Amino acid sequence: CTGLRFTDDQGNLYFGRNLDVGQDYGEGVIITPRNYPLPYKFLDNTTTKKAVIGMGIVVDGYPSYFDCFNEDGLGIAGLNFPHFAKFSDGPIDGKINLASYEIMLWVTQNFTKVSDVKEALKNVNLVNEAINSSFAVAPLHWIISDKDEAIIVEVSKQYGMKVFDDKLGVLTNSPDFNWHLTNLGNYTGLDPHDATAQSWNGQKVAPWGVGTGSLGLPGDSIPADRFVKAAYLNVNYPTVKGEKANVAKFFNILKSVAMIKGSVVNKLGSDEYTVYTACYSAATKTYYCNFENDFELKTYKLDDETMNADKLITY
Amino acid sequence: CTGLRFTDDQGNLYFGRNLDVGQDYGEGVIITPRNYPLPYKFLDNTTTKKAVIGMGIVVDGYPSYFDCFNEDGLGIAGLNFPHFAKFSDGPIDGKINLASYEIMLWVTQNFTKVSDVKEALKNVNLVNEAINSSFAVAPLHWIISDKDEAIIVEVSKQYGMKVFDDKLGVLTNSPDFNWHLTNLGNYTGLDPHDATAQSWNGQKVAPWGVGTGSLGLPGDSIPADRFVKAAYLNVNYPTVKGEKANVAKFFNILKSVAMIKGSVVNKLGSDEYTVYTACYSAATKTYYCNFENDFELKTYKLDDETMNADKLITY
Amino acid sequence: CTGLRFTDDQGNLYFGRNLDVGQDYGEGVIITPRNYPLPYKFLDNTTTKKAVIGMGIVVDGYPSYFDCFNEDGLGIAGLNFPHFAKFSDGPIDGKINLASYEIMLWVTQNFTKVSDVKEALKNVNLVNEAINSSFAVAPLHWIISDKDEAIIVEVSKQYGMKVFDDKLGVLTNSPDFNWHLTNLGNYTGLDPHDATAQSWNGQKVAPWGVGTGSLGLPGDSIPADRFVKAAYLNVNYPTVKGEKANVAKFFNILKSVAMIKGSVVNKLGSDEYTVYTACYSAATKTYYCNFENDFELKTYKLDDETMNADKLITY
Amino acid sequence: CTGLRFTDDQGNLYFGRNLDVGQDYGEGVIITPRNYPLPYKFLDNTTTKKAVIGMGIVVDGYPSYFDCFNEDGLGIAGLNFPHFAKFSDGPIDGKINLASYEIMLWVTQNFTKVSDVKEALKNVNLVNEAINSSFAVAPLHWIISDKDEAIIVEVSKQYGMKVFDDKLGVLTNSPDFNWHLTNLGNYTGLDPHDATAQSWNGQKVAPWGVGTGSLGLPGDSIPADRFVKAAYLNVNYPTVKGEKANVAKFFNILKSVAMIKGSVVNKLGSDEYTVYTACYSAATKTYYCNFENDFELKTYKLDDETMNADKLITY
Ligand SMILES: [K+]
Ligand SMILES: [K+]
Q: CB contact, 8 Å: A85 with chain B?
């Protein structure tokens, strides 16, 4: 998986992710309307303060999201964090206890500003518990963003719960976020500007085509390498104007770092690849997505009809 | 640029390209109908006998194509070949003399089989002449394909005219095609299969995520590096079923190797990037494209209406 | 810098380092004999009880070592650790307080087993103080080894004091040691075994020479890349027999990852390169070294003569 | 194998090679004195015009050299050239016919200047024949050098006989020399100057140590990779003064690109590694060498005693 966010020159947010997996979970776009029932394992059951949209599966009436985005422009995406993610054996007294899967709706329902999310997380404890005993607990970490800031939430056996400011606007998978930040120092030789003709002891050595300044940029799907490349592309991609250009920019970047079918076979013999790529535009409250076997952009919207529905809207 | 071709298991051809440039040239989709006037600089003037579709620019009624594809499922794309391409100073008696830009329509009008093209190219002479003196001659090389085979045509100062069978289904830019073929032997270490946990003198060393077998796959836009990655992806991408899946597979591959805006600045200070990606489906006579600033797939079609029109159709 | 240790099949230790710097420090080989005065900044002054040998400089009669090795087969090397190394403002009551430069002789004088060192370091506090006002405090970390185990000692602002078991037998520079261990997992695609001929959709793609399994092995001098390569080389180098063969193996590995003059120019305009390579053979109590401008191996030995001298012996 | 040459600022030549093979061949230093019997397969038998020194094997009184250097400062080294090298099926009338192994003494016996060698090679034909039936023909190419110029000689099935000027002063193995020269253009991003602190959207991204400018420099033993690194190191290594410093510079470069035992296993299960490194100093007529299992520099010299001996001098 790769998560990505950026804004245009006016603070309109574009935020989304590739889902890179080796199986079909049956996911689809789900709109959760306002005042929908919202049960919690360790908190008072309530109803939704806000409408949200995202990709997920419905389980006994509960919309379980891979990523979701609220009508007020705040979103979250859960990304695989294997060999690292580790949650509580059970709830802890005096903490806001959440089964890990509950963080998706806890964040998007209760907040609009990442600043408030960060303050609240100081008292959150994530618990190693699935929605029911028929599901395993996914080892995830999360990227959360509004128009001003993205943060990373990681709860690991190694380090406990850590929350990072993510000025790069990207996230991939293991290892931990600070490891990846540190890795970027090793790629400061990367330069968008082309090299030019040189004299190697009088032998002319000159580029054959453009792109020579990014010598050493990795193109494989190892999480560390997609992090380096996603960050490099995001920070150097110009700011563009308008919905179409910003959505295209977003898909240009994530399709660049997609996991291509056939090029990755896991130890069990299964292909792993980018099954979908999705972008939420906060400005238009529109969720854009396409799929490995269907490249046409599909669009779904939080609007008057959908946000005020009486039930979950599934597509 | 990157050209790409493959088929499904029924022999349906998908064939197209990224155009990587620093500039919008004002190009667009042009359908050239049957019976359209076709002058030549050295051959007899005639008319088109086959409808073609592709991206290009109209100059004084003449459609000058970046890529184009005839109704019988054979196509050609011209890609940048700097520091190599060089054509004859003039026509040569006894040869089929073509100003280099004329190869696009000469190929698509006169052939349905690449085996016929390869035979006729033995007596072809490309000439260093533009449609008129108000235009430069572009230093190009070409990939030509039908459902059965792709060939590369290169005319260089270094080696004269060479025609290669292209079983990899790909082409990028300089240097010459045999140089790139030879380069692939240096990447035989690439493996789609993940590595697994190792013992380095008792220290556990194990992958953090999937993708570790392709260690060393380059991710920059240097032509040689895009050639290795495009070829690697194409031969390992499985055969897929149906029009939507094959079109998506095509764009999955070419967007993976696209030149991302801001990540490449040429020596004159201009961004170079993939301005469009296009795919011709022979089976549906459909030209699909999207653009750097508009990601939605657009479709243009050779059908009874467009193939028999009285004029060039421009969109 | 790169530090390196391994043994033969009989537990004879070979342990040393490259010194990669951009200034001439006038270093030379120093033997400190038994019963030599040994002042401390915070501990009671004393005398040496074990002869040591290594490279360093003499300050006011004090041998300040880059690396040193005692007659009982235990040694230590200090390597640059910039942007990480951070020692305490002053001594802490209750701790064994050492100015950081004092760890060299404190380790080699008081210990013959790394397991005792590990235990004792639990009460050590390193202090940010140089030998005198005219010297800056060097931002170092250390590798310590006997014939059975190597440990890394790092004291950082980020993490405080950490002590690691170093099964890879290597150390370079920043960042911290657990970061480097973690990085190794991204290189599990490395394989000493050559690849063999492949068919890329019927195109024969085959190695031109040996070595194709180590595709992606980095050859630059970034510390993380020298760490990967040094570790890979050390753990895959066969065990060899005898002093000559083990010393050559040692220099083969370290010269492979040396920083070559002219290939690295620091931000101040100065060449940085491997000024010397040194190997201590515990079995023969011999210090072998050569220099950037003189490749002949020079040998210096802890002798009945030298170990019982009346003064420092400086070459 | 890697061949290497350079001069100091007085035109003093230092020229040598790594031999990278799977097993020791029993080779050793051989001095061939003046007036020594010199048979030829297809030329008149004669005696040596000059004394030469190098590494090789004596076969029935004939010194068969891996590299040899004459008393007037001209030398030659034969390196592996598999999948390319192809010599003529028998001698050709009108040519100077040499069994490929005979080029070693023919060049060093008959010439002082590389300019004269280049002119003479216009009439040379290399024949596919070994010294006798007990040996196979090795697929070799050659680097030849004096104080002014180095040339590469390659005779291939693909291109016939080619002679190149080698301003880089390096040679490795396959593919052909022009392929490698062309490859260098893809490494123009290499820069000895360190990168400096950067702001990635406000995130400080800065080097952890020196060496960041050479990002992407390959460190594996694939011939194309060692060629890039050897060329890069040689042209950027400063000119140094005096015999000791120049010999050390020479071993610094070649040991940097040595093939390290255990890191390369060919497809027949054999380790491949640098068995020796050797440097001929023309100014002192001294052959220096060390071996994988003995790092001490050994020295052998052409002087009045050895150049006027009455037999081969072996060591
Ligand atoms: K509840
Ligand atoms: K003869």
A: no
| Ramachandran bin of D254, using left for φ above 0, alpha for ψ from -120 to 50, beta for the remaining angles | alpha
The backbone region for D313, taken as left when phi is positive above 0, alpha when psi lies in -120 to 50, beta otherwise, is beta
Ramachandran region of residue B211, left (φ > 0), alpha (ψ -120 to 50) or beta? Answer: left
In this structure, are residues C104 and C68 in contact, taking their beta carbons and an 8 Å threshold?
yes
Contact assignment for A219 to B218 by CB distance below 8 Å: yes
Nearest 10 degrees: CA dihedral of C30, C32, C37, C41? Answer: 60
Interface of D with C in 207-246 (CB under 8 A): 207-225, 229, 232-233, 236-238, 240, 244-245
B269-297 exposure pattern, b = at least 16 Cβ within 10 A, e = fewer: eebbbbbbbbbbbbbebbbbbbbbbbbbb
For chain A, how big is the Rg over CA atoms in Å? 20
Q: Measure in Å the smallest separation between the Cα of C254 and chain D Cα atoms.
A: 9
Alpha-carbon radius of gyration of chain D? 20
CA B35/CA B49 separation, integer angstroms: 6
Q: Please judge whether A188 and D216 are an interchain contact, meaning their C-beta atoms are less than 8 angstroms apart.
A: no
For residues C165 and C178, give the distance between their C-alpha atoms in angstroms, rounded to a whole number: 10
Interatomic CA distance for residues A199 and A188, integer angstroms: 24
Q: How far is Cα D18 from Cα D254, in angstroms, rounded to an integer? A: 7
Domain hosting A142: range is 2-314
Backbone angles phi, psi at B198, to 5 degrees: -125, 165
- Residue A28 contacts residue A315 (beta carbons within 8 Å): yes
Please give the tally of structural domains in chain B.
1
Question: Could you tell me if D263 lies within 8 Å of chain B, comparing CB atoms?
Answer: no
Give the span between the Cα atoms of A208 and C11, in whole angstroms.
53
d(CA A124, CA D104): 77
For residue A135, give the CATH number of its domain: 3.60.60.10
Give me the sign of the Cα torsion angle A181, A183, A187, A188.
positive
Q: Is A4 on the interface with B (CB under 8 A)?
A: no
- SS3 of chain D: CEEEEEECCCCCEEEEEEEEECCCCCCEEEEECCCCEECCCCCCCEECCCCEEEEEEEECCEEEEEEEEECCCCEEEEEECCCCECCECCCCCCCEEEEHHHHHHHHHHHCCCHHHHHHHHCCEEEECCCCCCCCCCCCEEEEEECCCCEEEEEEECCCEEEEEECCCCEECCCCCHHHHHHHHHHHCCCCCECCCCEEECCEEECCCCCCHHHCCCECCCCHHHHHHHHHHHHHHCCCCCCHHHHHHHHHHHHHHCCCCCCCCECCCCCECEEEEEEEEECCCCEEEEEECCEEEEEEEECCHHHHCCCCCEEC
User: Which is it for the CA torsion B283, B286, B287, B292, positive or negative?
Assistant: negative
Distances (CA, A) of B141 to B84, B166, B253, C163: 9, 13, 21, 59
Q: Which chains have 3 or more CB–CB distances shorter than 8 Å to chain C?
A: A, B, D
Nearest to A182 among C179, C185, C186 (CB): C179
Q: Check: CB of residue C293 under 8 Å from CB of residue C284.
A: no
Strand bridging mode C286-291 / D28-32:
unpaired
Q: Under DSSP, is residue C233 helix (H, G, I), strand (E, B) or coil? A: helix
E strands, chain A, in order: 2-7, 13-21, 28-32, 37-38, 46-47, 52-59, 62-70, 75-80, 96-99, 124-127, 140-145, 150-156, 160-165, 170-171, 198-200, 203-205, 273-281, 286-291, 294-301, 313-314
C-alpha distances in Å from residue B153, one per residue of B177, C78, C307: 9, 60, 76
Residues of D in contact with C238 (CB under 8 A): 261-262, 271
Judge whether B1 counts as a catalytic residue.
yes
How many residue pairs bridge chain A and chain C with CB atoms within 8 Å of each other? 16
